[PDB]
Design a protein around this ligand. Structure first.
Ligand SMILES: *[C@@H]1O[C@H](CO[C@@H]2O[C@@H](C)[C@@H](O)[C@@H](O)[C@@H]2O)[C@@H](O[C@@H]2O[C@H](CO)[C@@H](O[C@@H]3O[C@H](CO[C@H]4O[C@H](CO)[C@@H](O)[C@H](O)[C@@H]4O)[C@@H](O)[C@H](O)[C@@H]3O)[C@H](O)[C@H]2NC(C)=O)[C@H](O)[C@H]1NC(C)=O
Ligand SMILES: CS(=O)(=O)N[C@@H](CCCCN)C(=O)NC[C@H](CC1(C(=O)N[C@@H](Cc2ccc(O)cc2)C(=O)O)CCCC1)C(=O)O
Ligand SMILES: *[C@@H]1O[C@H](CO[C@@H]2O[C@@H](C)[C@@H](O)[C@@H](O)[C@@H]2O)[C@@H](O[C@@H]2O[C@H](CO)[C@@H](O)[C@H](O)[C@H]2NC(C)=O)[C@H](O)[C@H]1NC(C)=O
Ligand SMILES: *[C@@H]1O[C@H](CO)[C@@H](O)[C@H](O)[C@H]1NC(C)=O
Ligand SMILES: [Cl-]
Ligand SMILES: [Cl-]
Ligand SMILES: [Mg+2]
Ligand SMILES: [Mg+2]
Ligand SMILES: [Zn+2]
Length: 605
């Protein structure tokens, strides 16, 4: 470790810990920068050489964490928990938590190589027929636009086999090393460390209680959509009392159902609220999508994207041969200057939402860039996920789409409302069970309740339990279907997204009220509300300097996650779907839990 970066001397009392914390953060900024820079260099240009440089950058961060962490334990381990300044307790408590830097050097190298190899498997997997399809755009477009059961099945099976199977041995090894590292910091397993970010002793119970409120909305949406699919695919491929085959819902993971809106829209004679075809007819490209998203942010008197963002970002998939990680991402280089998005942008309405999601991450980075590096985080990780989704809620309204030229026809009637709320339910309510289950699966793997011998059995137990889907071909434990979802091999926690899909409606309600809007919540558009912008800016500028419960109280008037704003938003369609399902004599749920569809006659082709 370079001499500039090593801890010096500090007094073993609270006053010395303040000076230690100040000096830690000054050096950490430079270690953060070299780490982000090396991760960026590779994911936009996947080469063996860039992988090696990234592993070397990771090893430097471990050296730094060990040096300062051992210094913190030497001076403050028996006393920091009683320090009077709560912000200091948070920083010292983090520095004493060494993470993978607890691992001896050989195991650090093994850990870092596993993360590199797991990333590469996921982001270079292909499905082959001589010629081969990538996840993004090829398989993504098949799942979204094909209505051929056998083609959808070829893409779904091809992807899950190609990405999952080779990951399993690596994921087993990663899990053990990760647990070994965090156990030395005092956590029972890695999942307990991840959950600690929310600083709530009742986190898991609080989440389960939220899901109990939301589940009836999902069950009714599920039953209605299953009926719509039955009308298209027939009684052989859809069981009206069983789980939906997992490849028919528009998305590789059945996690958003937006793409099947045309099969479920209740009143197709009203305006077509999927504006993709109009974006295509009008010639939108990726740069238009990012500039329109930026202009929403500046309409609120939030910050434009700086030149470094436009000069450095990757906004389309390279067509010059390179392999890149196409999964969208937003980067803080921790130098207060460089902030970038990497997105393999496609010209679609749901991608326009994704652009806003990613720019929300950038806006957060811009607003807290001058805090100490350890406070340059969301008030909790769910806050970071909600920012862009909140703006996108306004952007998707038919009223806003009209303003930006994407929906000529204007209507304000009950049918048009049901159409819009149904479309939003396909995006937001359908996600909730998936958002919830992914880290239930991973928490059980980290705790050892789900050993390798049950990775897929327990995955599909949860997928059926919560989402009411089933795999369309037979799976066994050589399959590793969790590993075919980006966040598993890339070791990105997922419960942040369940939190953010609830939180974003709490934010929407608060901002709409601040903007002076007095209509139905689902028709609010906060565009050009500088008062809403100022209220949002306060959250963004706080970073993680204050407990999330108190930041939330200042913003929305309550100190807890609450499902009521989401329920208020959807109330009209919640009532409508319940009435429709009763009228159609639906079974809510999937009591034929064993059912799986047959194979097509000529399968594989
Ligand atoms: C789409 O249309 C709706 C409905 O419009 C009303 O209903 C239809 C059937 C016709 O009668 C229209 O002429 C009506 O306007 C619009 O929602 C209404 O928006 C207006 C604001 O533009 C709202 O009026 C405000 O309401 C404030 C709150 O008071 C209400 O709340 C009490 C409970 O405390 C409730 O019981 C009562 O109904 C009150 O009206 C009030 O402070 C303020 O001064 C103003 O009166 C009205 O409440 C809205 N109705 C509903 C049902 O939400 C949408 O704005 C319109 N959308 C678009 C995009 O144009
Ligand atoms: C680690 S980092 O430096 O690279 N920066 C992170 C953000 C740091 C936040 C600070 N803690 C990052 O960029 N992460 C990538 C991830 C990508 C997306 C992702 O996976 N979304 C989940 C769930 C989801 C969320 C919103 C939505 O509307 C629909 C689905 C998914 O698609 O399954 C794919 C497109 C939308 C986001 C992200 O932005 O959150
Ligand atoms: C687990 O499954 C693999 C994959 O076989 C496919 O999936 C099964 C669930 C089943 O539906 C099979 O009909 C599918 O072909 C099995 O490995 C394959 O076994 C077949 C024999 O059926 C053989 O021809 C292939 O070479 C094997 N490999 C592949 C990639 O297909 C495996 O035997 C199953 N059992 C175990 C314990 O892994
Ligand atoms: C990709 O990485 C290699 C080194 O691995 C480098 O020589 C090359 O310039 C990079 N390409 C781009 C477009 O940055
Ligand atoms: Cl965060
Ligand atoms: Cl999280
Ligand atoms: Mg789409
Ligand atoms: Mg989608
Ligand atoms: Zn995000």
């Amino acid at each position: 470790l370079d001499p500039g970066l090593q801890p010096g001397q500090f007094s073993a009392d609270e006053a010395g810990a303040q000076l230690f914390a100040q000096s830690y953060q000054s050096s950490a900024e430079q270690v953060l920068f070299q780490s982000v820079a090396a991760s960026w260099a590779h994911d936009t240009n996947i080469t063996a050489e860039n992988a090696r440089r990234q592993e070397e950058a990771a090893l430097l961060s471990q050296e730094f964490a060990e040096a300062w962490g051992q210094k913190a334990k030497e001076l403050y381990e028996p006393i920091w928990q009683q320090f009077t300044d709560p912000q200091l307790r948070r920083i010292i408590g983090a520095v004493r938590t060494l993470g993978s830097a607890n691992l001896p050097l050989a195991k650090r190298q093994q850990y870092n190589a596993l993360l590199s190899q797991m990333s590469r498997i996921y982001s270079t997997a292909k499905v082959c027929l001589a010629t081969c399809w990538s996840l993004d755009p090829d398989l993504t477009n098949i799942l979204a636009s094909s209505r051929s059961y056998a083609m959808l099945l070829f893409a779904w099976e091809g992807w899950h086999n190609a990405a999952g199977i080779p990951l399993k041995p690596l994921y087993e090894d990663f899990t053990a090393l990760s647990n070994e590292a965090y156990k030395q910091d005092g956590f029972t397993d890695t999942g307990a460390y991840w959950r600690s970010w929310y600083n709530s002793p009742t986190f898991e119970d609080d989440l389960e209680h939220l899901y109990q409120q939301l589940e009836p909305l999902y069950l009714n949406l599920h039953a209605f959509v299953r009926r719509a699919l039955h009308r298209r695919y027939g009684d052989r491929y859809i069981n009206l009392r069983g789980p939906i085959p997992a490849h028919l819902l528009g998305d590789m993971w059945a996690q958003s159902w937006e793409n099947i809106y045309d099969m479920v829209v209740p009143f197709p004679d009203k305006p077509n609220l999927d504006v993709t075809s109009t974006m295509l007819q009008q010639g939108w490209q990726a740069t238009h999508m990012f500039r329109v998203a930026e202009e929403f942010f500046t309409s609120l008197e939030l910050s434009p994207m700086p030149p470094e963002f436009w000069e450095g970002s990757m906004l389309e998939k390279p067509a010059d041969g390179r392999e890149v990680v196409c999964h969208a991402s937003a980067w803080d280089f921790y130098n207060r200057k460089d902030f970038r998005i990497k997105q393999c942008t496609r010209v679609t309405m749901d991608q326009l939402s994704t652009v806003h999601h990613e720019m929300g991450h950038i806006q957060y980075y811009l607003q807290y860039k001058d805090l100490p590096v350890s406070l340059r985080r969301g008030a909790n990780p769910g806050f970071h996920e909600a920012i862009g989704d909140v703006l996108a809620l306004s952007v998707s309204t038919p009223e806003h789409l009209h303003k930006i030229g994407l929906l000529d026809r204007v209507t304000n009637d009950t049918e048009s409302d049901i159409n819009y709320l149904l479309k939003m339910a396909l995006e937001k309510i359908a996600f909730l069970p998936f958002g919830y289950l992914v880290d239930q699966w991973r928490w059980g793997v980290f705790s050892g309740r789900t050993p390798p011998s049950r990775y897929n059995f327990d995955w599909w137990y949860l997928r059926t339990k919560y989402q009411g889907i089933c795999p369309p071909v037979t799976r066994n434990e050589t399959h590793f279907d969790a590993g075919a979802k980006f966040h598993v091999p890339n070791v990105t926690p997922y419960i942040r997204y369940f939190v953010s899909f609830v939180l974003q409606f709490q934010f929407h309600e608060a901002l709409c009220k601040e903007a002076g809007y007095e209509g139905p919540l689902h028709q609010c558009d906060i565009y050009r509300s500088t008062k809403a912008g100022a209220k949002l800016r306060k959250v963004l500028r706080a970073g993680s300097s204050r407990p999330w419960q108190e930041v939330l109280k200042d913003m929305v008037g309550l100190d807890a996650l609450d499902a009521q704003p989401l329920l208020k938003y959807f109330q009209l369609v919640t009532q409508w779907l319940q009435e429709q399902n009763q009228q159609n004599g639906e079974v809510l749920g999937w009591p034929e839990y064993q059912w799986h569809p047959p194979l097509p006659d000529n399968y594989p082709e």
